[PDB]
């Protein structure tokens, strides 16, 4: 049966193993003899399966670690709400959202940093924020600072409860592996219980507190006069005054006259003209429908009662001629190995973050967020980066599963075996695809540069010399534009105005606009595809060739991350799947960097801007994307050089912090190249010279210093490279968008 079964008091509570630093691993528990011990203590900190063999113990450690992480996240939600409560201008922004710059952080006057408390409107001096939390709270219906303070206190209480839960579920009552492996009940409760009831509760909150407050705010009622949420929750007369369908009660729900709730449950679509964002009635209907969908989906898998599915049987039933045994063994793999689950979950989380980035900008969900140009850019770019990082984590943990938890006795003649048996074909064909795609997509840019420099615009791959029109994307956009009448008759507007339709604008600034697709869009989209394909090549090759290869038949024996297998065979450098991830992180970094550059330039040139009373559409850069994005010279001039002005000229102003971070991120990006290009042998010899200098003075340490390991040097170089590049883009985008928008 599916049952609760836990062991009591499995681990005592004591600081003795806090004092003992390297207790978790057998080798580290001995104590230090070189400084590599210190690094390995951090490297192997959360490698539970290397520490303990018991899957039960690994699961318990993971469960309590999840609790600790949730405590951290609750403290983070608390910081956001509390800073909005105290050190902010949320009330001023709520009164006047368009002119007030949102700010929820204040520096102290010590060393001249007080200038960073710039003019953000509302009689408030502080650092402008770009996280969209102000718009989030306006959507939620928060109109006072006491609400922010009290939800911050609640978040702190939840963080304390989560720390307590993490301690309790490891030191007092830890579950068993039998409890952990109840995947069917876990799926049922996560679908119906977590997602379904979360959506249902949020739909109720929206219907009862967000629709009335936001409708009154859009009407013009100032926040002081707004009736409080507790009054709105039970005052059915006021809710009938606002939405007439509420006077009918819940009888139109229990009887299936659901059409009576059409006023506050809508399928309007488009964007609200007042706030320039999605209709909150639409969002409430959305969350209600999703609650129903998830509760329906969560009753699929078997439990104590006879009804339900078995994922084992579902997988085993799917086997084809070209797949042999098919999905046999995958249920056991995913029930026994945590790394496989981590790989799948990280992949889907990253793809979801990217999909979130794509959806939020095209369909602004929060009020006055579309006009808040820094918020849109910041959220899109952030979620893109998080998505790429999660995808590479997925690849890494797939490789870890392959190295450690793979077994042919289990996975004989199944899909995993059949994939490993033609990995060579897979990687060779992806290699050809990568070469072809990169050659075409980048050589079109290079051709454009060559012909422009040769003074031959008639020979360009431009919109007027040799057109490469995205006919299929244009067709899909046309279908979406015509959808509200023909293929979605109950929809009163298009899902997103990017496909087509009217120009939504709040005050002078433009919320959303149709985004045209031409030759430059074709080129940059194929560039995106090329970058994604090369990243997939690197990561998939690392995962497939983690067990072994033609170069190293016994690569699994060496481990997951190892420096090499010597200079033999002409050199076996970075053969490890870890090193494959190390290289794929550079490539997802390049991919996401080009994606965010495309987003920034396209939205600045074609979407964001201002519209006058007559209708004079004036964009930030002036539509230069369509004619300058055809060349790498144009990318270097009209995007990087042109928009770096607001960063470099920021000294002596509130964005001077962005200027400093621009320089510092540049410095760290360059500092990374030392680790990336150099090698441990030189550094160990230099440390030997320095150690002689210290020993001459009788102060050479007992913990002998050593150059960093090879894998560690690669990791440090990659981390510094990513930090420097991402910080450079962060400062550049934030300074540019805050200055111009």
């Amino acid at each position: 049966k599916v049952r609760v079964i836990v062991d009591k008091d499995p681990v005592a509570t004591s600081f003795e193993k806090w004092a003992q630093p390297g207790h978790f691993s057998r080798t580290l528990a001995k104590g230090p003899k070189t400084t590599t011990w210190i690094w390995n203590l951090h490297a192997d900190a959360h490698d539970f399966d290397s520490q303990t063999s018991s899957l039960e113990d690994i699961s318990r450690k993971i469960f309590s670690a999840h609790f600790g992480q949730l405590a951290i996240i609750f403290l983070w939600v608390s910081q956001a709400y509390f800073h909005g409560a105290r050190f902010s201008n949320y009330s001023a922004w709520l009164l006047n959202p368009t002119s007030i710059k949102p700010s929820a952080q204040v520096v102290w006057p010590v060393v001249g940093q007080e200038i960073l408390n710039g003019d953000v409107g509302g009689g408030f001096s502080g650092v402008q924020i770009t996280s969209g939390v102000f718009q989030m709270w306006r959507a939620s219906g928060i109109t006072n600072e006491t609400e922010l303070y009290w939800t911050a206190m609640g978040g702190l209480m939840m963080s304390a409860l989560m720390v307590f839960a993490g301690w309790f579920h490891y030191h007092k009552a830890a579950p068993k592996l039998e409890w952990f492996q109840n995947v069917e009940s876990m799926m049922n409760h996560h679908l119906a219980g977590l997602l379904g009831l979360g959506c249902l509760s949020w739909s109720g909150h929206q219907i009862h507190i967000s629709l009335p407050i936001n409708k009154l705010l859009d009407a013009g009622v100032a926040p002081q006069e707004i009736p409080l949420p507790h009054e709105l929750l039970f005052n059915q007369d006021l809710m009938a005054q606002l939405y007439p369908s509420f006077k009918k009660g819940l009888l139109p729900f229990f009887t299936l006259n659901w059409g009576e709730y059409s006023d506050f449950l809508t399928f309007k679509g488009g964007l609200n003209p007042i706030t320039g964002s999605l209709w909150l009635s639409d969002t409430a209907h959305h969350h209600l429908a999703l609650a129903v969908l998830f509760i329906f989906a969560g009753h699929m898998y078997r439990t104590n009662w006879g009804i339900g599915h078995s994922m084992k049987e579902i997988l085993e039933a799917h086997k084809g001629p070209l797949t042999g045994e098919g999905h046999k063994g995958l249920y056991e793999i995913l029930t026994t190995s945590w790394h496989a689950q981590l790989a799948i979950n990280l992949a889907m989380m990253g793809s979801l973050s990217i999909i979130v980035a794509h959806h939020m900008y095209a369909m602004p969900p929060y009020p006055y967020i579309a006009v808040d140009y820094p918020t849109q850019l910041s959220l899109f770019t952030h979620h893109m980066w998080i998505g790429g990082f999660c995808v590479c984590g997925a690849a890494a943990h797939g490789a870890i599963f392959m190295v450690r938890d793979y077994s042919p006795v289990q996975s004989y003649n199944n899909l995993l075996d059949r994939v490993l048996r033609h990995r060579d074909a897979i990687i060779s064909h992806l290699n050809w695809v990568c070469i072809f795609l990169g050659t075409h997509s980048f050589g079109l840019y290079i051709h454009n540069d060559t012909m422009r420099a040769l003074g031959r615009p008639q020979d360009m791959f431009s919109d007027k010399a040799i057109q490469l029109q995205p006919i299929f994307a244009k067709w899909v956009q046309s279908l979406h534009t015509l959808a509200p009448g023909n293929t979605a008759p109950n929809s009163l507007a298009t899902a997103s105005y990017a496909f087509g339709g009217d120009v939504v604008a709040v005050n002078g600034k433009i919320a959303m606009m149709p985004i045209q697709l031409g030759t430059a869009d074709f080129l940059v989209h194929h560039i995106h595809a090329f970058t994604i394909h090369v990243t997939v090549l690197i990561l998939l090759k690392g995962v497939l060739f983690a067990r072994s290869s033609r170069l190293i038949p016994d690569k699994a024996n060496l481990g997951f991350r190892f420096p090499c297998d010597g200079p033999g065979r002409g050199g076996t450098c970075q053969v490890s799947a870890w090193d494959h991830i190390f290289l794929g992180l550079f490539w997802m970094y390049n991919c996401i960097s080009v994606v965010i550059f495309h987003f920034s330039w396209k939205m600045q040139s074609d979407v964001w801007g201002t519209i006058s009373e007559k209708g004079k559409i004036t964009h930030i850069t002036g539509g230069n994307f369509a004619n300058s994005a055809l060349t790498i010279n144009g990318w270097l001039r009209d995007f990087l050089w042109s928009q770096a002005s607001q960063v470099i000229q920021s000294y002596g102003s509130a964005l001077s912090a962005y200027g400093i971070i621009f320089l510092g991120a540049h410095f760290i990006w360059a500092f990374s190249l030392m680790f990336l290009f150099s090698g441990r042998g030189y550094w160990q010899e230099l440390i030997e010279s320095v150690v002689w200098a210290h020993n001459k003075l009788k102060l050479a340490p007992a913990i002998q210093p050593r150059a960093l390991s090879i894998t560690q040097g690669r990791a440090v170089g990659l981390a510094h490279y990513l930090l420097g590049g991402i910080g450079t883009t962060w400062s550049f985008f934030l300074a540019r968008i805050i200055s111009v928008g």
Binding site: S14, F15, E16, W18, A19, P21, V110, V111
Partner: protein, 40 residues
């Protein structure tokens, strides 16, 4: 505050963070009380 927790607080990273915290606070307070000292 058993001997084990005192030992843990005596560990190298905790001590580094504590001492550099005190040092940074000392420098910042000296800046507040004697600000803009581009000289002696």
């Amino acid at each position: 505050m058993s001997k084990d927790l005192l030992k843990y607080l005596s560990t190298a990273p905790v001590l580094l963070t504590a001492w550099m915290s005190l040092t940074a606070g000392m420098i910042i307070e000296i800046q507040r009380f004697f600000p803009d000292s581009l000289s002696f």
